[PDB]
Every structure is written in structure tokens, then in C-alpha cells.
Amino acid sequence: IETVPVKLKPGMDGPKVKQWPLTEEKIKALVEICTEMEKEGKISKIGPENPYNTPVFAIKKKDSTKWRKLVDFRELNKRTQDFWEVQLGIPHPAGLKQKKSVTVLDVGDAYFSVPLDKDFRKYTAFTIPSINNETPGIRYQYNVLPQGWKGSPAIFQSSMTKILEPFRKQNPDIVIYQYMDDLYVGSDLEIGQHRTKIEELRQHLLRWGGYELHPDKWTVQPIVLPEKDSWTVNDIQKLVGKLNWASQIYAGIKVRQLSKLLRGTKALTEVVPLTEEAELELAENREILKEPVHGVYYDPSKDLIAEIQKQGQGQWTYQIYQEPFKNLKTGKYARMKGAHTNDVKQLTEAVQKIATESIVIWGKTPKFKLPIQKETWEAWWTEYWQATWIPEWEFVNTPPLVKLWY
Amino acid sequence: PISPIETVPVKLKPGMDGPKVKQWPLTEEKIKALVEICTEMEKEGKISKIGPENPYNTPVFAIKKKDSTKWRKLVDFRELNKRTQDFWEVQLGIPHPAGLKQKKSVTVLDVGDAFYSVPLDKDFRKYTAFTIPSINNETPGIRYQYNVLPMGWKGSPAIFQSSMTKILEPFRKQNPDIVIYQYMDDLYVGSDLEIGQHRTKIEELRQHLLRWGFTTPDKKHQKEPPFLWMGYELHPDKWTVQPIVLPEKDSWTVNDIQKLVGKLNWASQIYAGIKVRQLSKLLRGTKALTEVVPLTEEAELELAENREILKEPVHGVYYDPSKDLIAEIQKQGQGQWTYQIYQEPFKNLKTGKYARMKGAHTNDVKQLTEAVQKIATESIVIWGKTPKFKLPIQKETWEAWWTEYWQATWIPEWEFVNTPPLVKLWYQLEKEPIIGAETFYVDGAANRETKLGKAGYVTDRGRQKVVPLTDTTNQKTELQAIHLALQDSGLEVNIVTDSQYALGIIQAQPDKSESELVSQIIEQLIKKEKVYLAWVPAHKGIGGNEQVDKLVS
DNA sequence: TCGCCCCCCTTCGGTGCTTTGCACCGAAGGGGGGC
Ligand SMILES: N#C[C@]1(COP(=O)(O)OP(=O)(O)OP(=O)(O)O)/C(=C\F)[C@@H](n2cnc3c(=O)[nH]c(N)nc32)C[C@@H]1O
Ligand SMILES: [Mg+2]
Numbered sequence: 001i002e003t004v005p006v007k008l009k010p011g012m013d014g015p016k017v018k019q020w021p022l023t024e025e026k027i028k029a030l031v032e033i034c035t036e037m038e039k040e041g042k043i044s045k046i047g048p049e050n051p052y053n054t055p056v057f058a059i060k061k062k063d064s065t066k067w068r069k070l071v072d073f074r075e076l077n078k079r080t081q082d083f084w085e086v087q088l089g090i091p092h093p094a095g096l097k098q099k100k101s102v103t104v105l106d107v108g109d110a111y112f113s114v115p116l117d118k119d120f121r122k123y124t125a126f127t128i129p130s131i132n133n134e135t136p137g138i139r140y141q142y143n144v145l146p147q148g149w150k151g152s153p154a155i156f157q158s159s160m161t162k163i164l165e166p167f168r169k170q171n172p173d174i175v176i177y178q179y180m181d182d183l184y185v186g187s188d189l190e191i192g193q194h195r196t197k198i199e200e201l202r203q204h205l206l207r208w209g210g211y212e213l214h215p216d217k218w219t220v221q222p223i224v225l226p227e228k229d230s231w232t233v234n235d236i237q238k239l240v241g242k243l244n245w246a247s248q249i250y251a252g253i254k255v256r257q258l259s260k261l262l263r264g265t266k267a268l269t270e271v272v273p274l275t276e277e278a279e280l281e282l283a284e285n286r287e288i289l290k291e292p293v294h295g296v297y298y299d300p301s302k303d304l305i306a307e308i309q310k311q312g313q314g315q316w317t318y319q320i321y322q323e324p325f326k327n328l329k330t331g332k333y334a335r336m337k338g339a340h341t342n343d344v345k346q347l348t349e350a351v352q353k354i355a356t357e358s359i360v361i362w363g364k365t366p367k368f369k370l371p372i373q374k375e376t377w378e379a380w381w382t383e384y385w386q387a388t389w390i391p392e393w394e395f396v397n398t399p400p401l402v403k404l405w406y
Numbered sequence: 407p408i409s410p411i412e413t414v415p416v417k418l419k420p421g422m423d424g425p426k427v428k429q430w431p432l433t434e435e436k437i438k439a440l441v442e443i444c445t446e447m448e449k450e451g452k453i454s455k456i457g458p459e460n461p462y463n464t465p466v467f468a469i470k471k472k473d474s475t476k477w478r479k480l481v482d483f484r485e486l487n488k489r490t491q492d493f494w495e496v497q498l499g500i501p502h503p504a505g506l507k508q509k510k511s512v513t514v515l516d517v518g519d520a521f522y523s524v525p526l527d528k529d530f531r532k533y534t535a536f537t538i539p540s541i542n543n544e545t546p547g548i549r550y551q552y553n554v555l556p557m558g559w560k561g562s563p564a565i566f567q568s569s570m571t572k573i574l575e576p577f578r579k580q581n582p583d584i585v586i587y588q589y590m591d592d593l594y595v596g597s598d599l600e601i602g603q604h605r606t607k608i609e610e611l612r613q614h615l616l617r618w619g620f621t622t623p624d625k626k627h628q629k630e631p632p633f634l635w636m637g638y639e640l641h642p643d644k645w646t647v648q649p650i651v652l653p654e655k656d657s658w659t660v661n662d663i664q665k666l667v668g669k670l671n672w673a674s675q676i677y678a679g680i681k682v683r684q685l686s687k688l689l690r691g692t693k694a695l696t697e698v699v700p701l702t703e704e705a706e707l708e709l710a711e712n713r714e715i716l717k718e719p720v721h722g723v724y725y726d727p728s729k730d731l732i733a734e735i736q737k738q739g740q741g742q743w744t745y746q747i748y749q750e751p752f753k754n755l756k757t758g759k760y761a762r763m764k765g766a767h768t769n770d771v772k773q774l775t776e777a778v779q780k781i782a783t784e785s786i787v788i789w790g791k792t793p794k795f796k797l798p799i800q801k802e803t804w805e806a807w808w809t810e811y812w813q814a815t816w817i818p819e820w821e822f823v824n825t826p827p828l829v830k831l832w833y834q835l836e837k838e839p840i841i842g843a844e845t846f847y848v849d850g851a852a853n854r855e856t857k858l859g860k861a862g863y864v865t866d867r868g869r870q871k872v873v874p875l876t877d878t879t880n881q882k883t884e885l886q887a888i889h890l891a892l893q894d895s896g897l898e899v900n901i902v903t904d905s906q907y908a909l910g911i912i913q914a915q916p917d918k919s920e921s922e923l924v925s926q927i928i929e930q931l932i933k934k935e936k937v938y939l940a941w942v943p944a945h946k947g948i949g950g951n952e953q954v955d956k957l958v959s
Numbered sequence: 960t961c962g963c964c965c966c967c968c969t970t971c972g973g974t975g976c977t978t979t980g981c982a983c984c985g986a987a988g989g990g991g992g993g994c
Pocket of ligand 2: 516517518519520591
């Protein structure tokens with residue numbers, strides 16, 4: 001087959017990211033995986049004259065107890081030419097986020113049948129480490145379209161369209177969306193019925209080469225004001241400061257007469273009664289915060305941003321936006337392991353869940369602002385990652401000015 | 407000999423040409439020395455004479471070798487290195503003896519003239535040109551180029567390492583039950599074979615290396631313990647570091663203290679309890695490597711402690727994969743931590759220390775978490791797994807920390823060990839305001855252009871105070887205002903500020919800070935019985951906040 | 960008068976914040992050690 005000519009964006013060089021340490025289990029898995037792919041010509045052993053590198057690690061699901069190799073091509077994807085500019089990219093269907101159930105299938109293996117522009121392969125180098133540095137690193141570069149590279153779905157585009165062509169007309173009410181190495185496929189059947197059609201697709205795919213999502217249970221959680229009969233100065237101070245922040249989001253919110261109530265240098269535990277003029281103010285502000293904000297629409301040409309806050313006892317609130325204070329979506333994630341002991345595992349799971357919802361809804365992941373120290377996140381996150389994609393993220397230390405979302 | 411291994415193709419950076427640099431110490435002794443070295447190298451085909459059509463040049467020199475009676479040759483390729491292409495280095499770390507498993511039979515060998523046994527790519531040789539002068543400049547001079555990896559070139563280590571890996575891989579695949587540690591030209595070979603058979607595999611390995619052009623001189627062939635390896639001594643049951651000699655001076659310069667700290671850090675991998683914080687302090691605010699620095703009293707005590715630690719003999723043991731790894735941390739004070747990693751009690755695999763201050767404001771629980779993360783990473787590098795931890799922090803303390811701290815945090819499976827001083831939270835902010843406690847509405851403002859500010863408060867019981875501040879910032883004024891409330895209040899206090907900044911610092915329960923102002927606030931928070939710290943938005947006429955707002959003008 | 964790697968401690972300068980200094984972070988200086 002002919003290679004598609006691919007290029008890095010003007011004035012950019014390939015990734016030069018160091019490999020991080022990996023456990024024994026993952027090194028062994030990466031070597032058995034890479035030894036075979038070398039044998040099948042999918043990758044070639046290289047040396048140090050290739051100046052590029054990208055971290056590699058491995059993930060194992062508990063519904064799929066085999067190791068899956070994962071190359072963190074985030075830096076390479078950033079520096080790769082856009083394929084929307086070349087009109088090879090994938091359009092997102094607005095229909096998926098409505099469906100009863102959405103299953104995710106890893107079709108990254110399909111990319112291994114199409115060669116990569118030989119002049120671009122050097123940018124795909126990665127290095128397997130060794131326990132106790134018994135040996136130098138062993139380096140490989142791809143010869144095929146790599147899993148995790150954003151150009152692979154774009155180049156395989158018109159091929160995937162042919163593979164799914166029959167399944168699509170035979171099932172016109174199922175919607176398929178390809179994102180990276182994944183197929184997001186949703187329908188409105190009974191779970192049993194739906195699953196069945198999935199195995200059909202699987203076996204059709206299998207001829208050539210996790211768990212059910214449910215979009216309609218992704219309830220938005222809004223900004224709710226407490227309900228009390230007696231209000232202390234402090235209770236009102238928190239309420240005023242909470243509605244004051246919200247005035248940057250919502251419109252026509254007032255503190256004129258709740259702020260009046262704090263008149264004087266009062267003790268924080270003193271119970272101030274509530275005027276009609278201020279009781280009107282609150283119940284007015286309550287409704288404004290009940291049903292969502294008018295004037296916020298998705299822009300596909302801007303980045304998606306996600307902010308997460310730890311609320312304790314297993315709860316995590318999150319907001320997705322493009323312009324600050326114009327949230328496309330607010331939510332609240334909740335844990336699942338039966339011990340409620342591990343914050344980093346919960347945050348890692350929350351990030352995958354939020355990112356999955358963005359793919360389902362908008363077709364791309366957000367850039368995460370993670371409420372965690374960089375070095376704590378990097379010490380543990382790979383142990384809980386289960387997705388074939390990895391979103392962008394940055395690390396924030398923002399104390400809760402108010403418990404806005406709780 | 408020169409390996410028949412295929413060359414590694416190398417390039418210069420795009421747009422750049424080769425070096426062109428003239429020659430130094432044109433002495434006669436040196437010239438004759440240089441023609442003597444080069445003629446033997448030339449006879450073995452390591453270098454070749456070149457003429458004036460090659461425009462490039464680089465200068466030459468040579469230093470001594472640790473193995474006495476050998477000189478080492480070096481060419482100053484600083485310029486060529488700048489123009490040579492980048493390499494991805496495949497040496498990802500340093501093997502450690504604690505990662506070794508006990509072996510029945512062990513051998514340590516080394517390759518002779520390692521770099522000079524690897525050919526250099528044909529097209530790149532002309533850039534390694536160096537002229538040898540002529541009689542202190544009388545005539546044009548003798549030129550050579552390298553045909554092999556030169557010492558001093560940026561690409562030589564990586565290209566050798568890669569070449570050695572290719573050469574050993576046939577032997578590795580064939581003998582998986584032979585552990586080979588490959589560090590540059592140094593090979594450690596361990597096995598559970600009986601000595602007679604082990605030796606068969608050795609000369610089988612040596613003969614394989616020689617087919618590919620790698621000699622293994624008897625001189626560097628270690629057949630008997632103790633083995634000298636990577637700066638350690640390998641015994642059958644244990645390992646030592648080669649002796650570490652610290653400088654002893656009457657008058658210390660900055661540079662000697664730098665040397666001292668470096669030795670102590672190297673020693674801390676097996677010598678438990680090493681501290682360098684007071685010795686490193688001396689290095690701060692200094693401005694010359696030759697600057698004489700008088701040791702503080704604290705630095706003398708720390709060195710004395712370290713010297714007594716180093717006087718006693720210690721050894722590490724080897725790794726048993728059938729037993730768990732255990733990591734025990736102790737707190738040493740002033741942000742210093744020391745740890746031991748072991749599998750059976752009182753038999754350390756290695757030790758170490760953590761003493762970095764991350765952030766301007768932190769506490770012992772955060773630093774403990776960072777120590778655990780450092781140890782966790784080290785254990786992955788050496789043993790491929792993390793250890794079980796024994797930590798001097800109570801479960802109540804940790805659980806209080808991660809329920810009241812807003813950032814996700816975590817520590818693996820750990821077991822409380824009672825080795826005082828324990829790691830504790832030194833104060834906890836009340837989640838709710840305190841009945842009966844005085845309420846302080848604090849605020850402080852500084853004029854960005856002026857340098858002048860005020861800090862003060864107004865209270866529900868009727869007290870007021872303003873302090874003028876000079877040479878301050880706006881964030882300082884707000885910390886100063888909280889400082890006054892804590893100073894003039896009783897054991898229980900409610901405080902209202904409009905500084906998200908100050909609230910952010912304090913709500914993280916720091917117990918140490920680079921700021922002396924924050925340090926003072928911490929000392930006060932620890933003396934208090936109950937503190938509630940609430941925030942409000944400024945300039946929105948809140949009762950109290952507006953009162954003190956108006957006053958601090 | 961040289962090369963490559965890991966570690967620690969200090970300093971410096973770039974980044975972003977609904978900032979005006981501040982906190983964070985990575986790179987570079989010194990030292991240790993390896994070959
Ligand atoms: N490979 C290899 C060797 C082995 O160095 P090593 O002590 O083992 O000696 P050797 O192999 O040259 O020969 P020998 O073993 O004595 O018979 C090296 C590292 F491992 C390289 N190298 C060592 N030190 C230095 C050094 O300071 N400056 C530079 N620029 N390069 C060095 C060159 C040498 O080739
Ligand atoms: Mg040698």
C-alpha cells in the first residue's frame with residue numbers, strides 16, 4: 001500500500017520525552033508484546049542515533065486480564081499536522097449521546113495493517129527500560145500506523161468506513177463514532193439485545209482484523225443553596241460569598257439585601273433573623289440556580305477544559321467549559337471499590353469517566369486541571385488507567401474559596 | 407581489534423559544518439608524545455592520516471588512568487559536539503548492588519580499549535580531524551582522523567552501548583539463567599551453576615566477544631570475591647561501598663563544603679542517619695567557589711554526627727525476591743528524613759535520605775508523603791516493585807489529613823511504627839465557628855506603588871487596631887493582619903479575612919515556611935486551642951469586613 | 960582544557976494568575992559516584 005505523506009507542524013521537532021520507571025510485570029509484558037510485533041514487522045529495533053523518544057507503559061483491565069501496551073503519544077500528537085486541515089478527520093455525530101447504551105471497543109489493532117510514511121517513523125521511537133538498569137534501554141520505532149497516534153484514525157478513515165459500511169445500513173439506528181483507537185457504538189435496544197449486536201460487530205471486525213455506558217444517567221448537579229430555618233452570621237456570610245462568585249456565571253443575582261443583614265461587626269455564631277427583603281432575595285436566587293444558564297454553546301474550534309474538586313467521602317465535582325464561567329456541563333462523580341480509601345485511584349477513575357463523557361458528547365477529551373500534586377499523580381496514576389487514550393492535564397492547587405458545588 | 411559490527415550512521419545538526427579549531431600546547435615533549443601514541447593507533451587502524459583537503463580540525467590531549475601505567479587519550483571535541491546531532495541516550499540509570507540476587511558463581515570482566523573497538527561511520531570520520539603540530543610551529547604538521555569511536559565525542563557512549571547490546575543479545579537469549587549486568591564496558595556475570603560449568607560459559611562468552619572484536623584482558627578479569635563493581639565490593643553474603651574519605655580542613659571554602667556534602671550523599675545509600683542540611687546551608691548566598699566559609703556551630707555538630715556514623719562498619723545485603731520489601735522512615739528534624747529498605751530485620755538492602763523543601767510552605771505530612779514517593783520510585787528502579795512501608799505516623803493523623811485537605815493524596819499499604827518523633831498535624835482549623843470565641847474581622851492593604859501598607863482588625867467585642875507597614879506587599883499586609891488577630895486574641899478565635907491567598911496557605915496546615923512571617927503565624931496557630939478561619943469577598947460592604955476595610959484604608 | 964549516565968543542593972529565570980508579587984517548575988551551576 002502507498003504511504004500517506006505526513007508532516008509535523010511548521011517549526012516543530014519530534015517528541016523527546018524520557019521513559020519513566022516501570023514495574024516488573026509491565027516490563028515483562030512490554031517485552032513479550034514488542035518481541036512479537038518486531039517479528040511481524042510492525043516495529044523495528046533502532047539505536048540512539050534516533051534522537052526522539054516517547055514514554056511507553058502497559059495497562060491491564062480486570063474485565064480483560066491481558067496486558068495492553070500504551071504509548072503516551074500526547075507530545076507527538078500535539079506536534080503532528082492537523083488532519084482537519086487536510087480533511088481526513090472524523091466528524092462527530094450528535095446522535096450518540098442520546099442512545100440508551102454505548103459500548104467501547106478497542107480497534108487499535110486495525111491500524112497495524114497500514115504502513116507509516118517512512119520519513120515519519122523516527123518520531124515514534126520509544127524505549128523499554130530494565131529492572132535495576134541491568135542493560136541499556138531497548139528502542140523501537142513503528143512501521144505501521146501506531147495505536148495512540150492521532151494520525152492513525154485519520155489515515156485509516158476511508159478504510160474503516162468500508163469495514164463498517166454493511167453493519168451501518170443493516171443497523172441504521174445504531175450510531176458509531178471512532179475516537180482514536182476506540183469505537184463508541186450506541187443504540188436503544190435492551191442491554192441483552194444491544195450486547196448481541198455488539199458481538200455481531202465484533203465478529204465482523206474480527207473477520208478483517210469494557211462496560212456499557214449509559215448517557216441518560218449523567219445527571220448534571222447544579223449550584224444548590226442550603227435550606228435552614230435559623231441563619232447565623234457565618235451562614236449568611238458563606239451564602240453571600242457563594243452567590244457573589246455565582247454572579248460571574250449566572251445573571252441577575254443579588255447580594256444587596258443579604259449583605260445588608262450583616263450590618264455591624266457581629267459575632268459569627270449570632271443568629272440574625274431574615275427580612276422579607278432578603279428572604280425574597282434568596283428564593284429568587286434559588287430558582288436562577290435551579291435550571292441552567294442561557295447563552296452557553298459548544299465551540300468546536302476551542303479547547304475543552306475540565307476542573308475537578310475533591311468533596312470528600314468519595315465525591316468529586318467537575319465542570320467542563322471552554323470560556324471561564326460558561327460551563328457546558330457540571331457534574332459529580334462517585335467512587336466504586338468498597339473501601340473508599342484511595343484518592344488517587346478515585347481521581348484517575350473520575351478523569352477517565354469525565355473524558356469519556358466528552359468523547360460521547362463532543363468527540364474530544366478536555367484538558368484537565370487536576371487537584372493533586374504533580375509528583376503524587378505521577379507516582380500512581382498509571383496503576384489505575386484503563387483507557388487507550390490519555391488526555392492532557394495540568395496540576396492546580398486551588399483551595400476551596402467556597403464549597404460552590406457542594 | 408575493530409568490531410565488524412555495522413556502523414551507526416550519524417549526522418551533524420542541519421545547517422552546521424564541521425569544527426575548525428587550531429592547536430594548543432605545541433611543546434616538543436608533547437608533540438613527540440603525540441606522534442608516538444598516534445603511530446600505534448594507526449598501525450591498528452584506529453586512525454588514519456589525512457591531508458589539507460580536509461578543512462576540519464580539533465585539538466588533542468591526554469590524562470592518566472586509574473589502572474596505573476596506562477595513559478588515556480582525549481580530544482577536545484567540544485565544538486564538534488555542538489554541531490553533532492542529538493542522540494537518545496540508552497543508559498537510563500545506574501545498577502545498584504541492592505538489586506542483585508545472591509549467586510553461586512560470579513565473574514566481573516571488562517572490555518579493553520572498548521570505544522576503540524567500535525568503528526565510526528565512514529561519512530563522519532572527516533569531522534574528527536586533528537592536526538599534530540610541527541616542532542613548535544615550524545612546518546605544517548601531521549593530521550589524523552578517527553576510524554573508531556573517539557573518547558570525548560558526544561555520540562561515542564551511546565553508540566558503544568548500543569553496539570555492546572547487539573553483541574551480547576545472542577549470548578543473552580541463549581543463556582537466560584545467566585545474569586549479565588552491562589554497564590558500559592563492564593560486565594558482571596552471575597549464575598547458579600557450579601564453578602566448573604560457570605567458567606565454561608565465561609570463556610564461551612569471552613570467545614563470543616572476541617569474534618566481534620572485544621578483548622577481555624586478564625588484568626580486568628575478576629575471578630574471586632571481593633569483586634570491585636560500580637564503586638562497591640561484592641561479597642557472597644553482603645556488599646560494601648569502597649572507602650569514602652571525607653575532607654579534613656582547618657579552613658573550608660565553598661568548594662570543599664560542596665565536596666563534603668557530595669561525599670555524604672554518596673555515603674547515605676548504606677550509612678543510615680546521614681544529614682547535610684546544616685552543611686548545605688553554608689552554601690547559600692555565597693558568591694565564589696574560593697570563598698572561605700566559617701562553619702556554623704550547627705554545621706560542626708552535624709559533621710561530627712556524620713563522622714561517628716561513618717566510623718562504624720556497615721554492609722548491605724542482596725535481594726531475595728521470595729520475601730517482601732520493607733521501607734522504614736524516621737524523621738530527623740528541619741525537614742530531613744532518613745529511610746532503610748530491608749527484607750529481614752536489621753539486614754538493610756540499602757538506606758537513603760530525603761531532605762528537599764518543595765514549596766514555600768509545607769508540613770511534615772506532605773514531606774513524609776514525598777519521602778514515600780521517592781522511596782516508591784527508587785524501589786521500582788532497583789527491584790521492579792514498591793515496598794510495604796513502616797511509617798512513624800498514626801492512622802488518626804493520616805486520616806485526619808486526607809479528609810481535611812482538598813487535594814487528592816495517598817500512601818500505599820503502611821504500618822504504624824512508634825519511633826518518635828512521630829509525624830503529626832500541629833494544628834487543625836475548626837470546621838465550624840466557635841461559640842463564645844471573639845470574632846476578628848481582619849484586613850490589610852498595601853499601595854502597589856507606595857511600598858506602604860496597613861494591617862489591622864475590628865472585633866465583635868469592640869477591639870480595634872491598625873499597624874502601619876513599610877516596604878511591604880499587599881499579600882504581606884493580609885498575612886500581617888491575620889498575624890495580629892492571632893497575636894491579640896485568646897486561645898479560641900474566629901477570624902474573617904478577604905485574602906484568598908492567606909486563607910489558601912493557612913488552610914493547608916503548614917508547619918514550616920521559607921517566610922518568617924508565615925513562620926510566625928504557624929507558631930501562633932500551634933499555641934491556640936481552637937481557630938476558625940473564614941473568608942468573605944472584599945469591597946462588598948460586609949459587616950465587619952467593611953468596618954476594618956474602611957479603617958485600614 | 961574531553962564524553963555519556965544517575966543522585967543531591969542551590970540558584971535563576973520563565974509562566975500564569977480574573978496577579979502587580981507569588982508560587983510553581985524546569986534548567987543549569989556546583990558536588991558525589993559510575994564507566
Ligand atoms: N567503553 C569504554 C571506556 C572504558 O573505560 P575504561 O576505564 O574501562 O578503560 P578502556 O576501556 O578505555 O580500556 P581499559 O579498560 O583500561 O583497558 C569508557 C567508558 F567506559 C570511556 N571513558 C571512560 N572514561 C572516560 C573519560 O574519562 N573520558 C572519556 N571521554 N571517555 C571515557 C572510554 C573507554 O573506552
Ligand atoms: Mg575497557
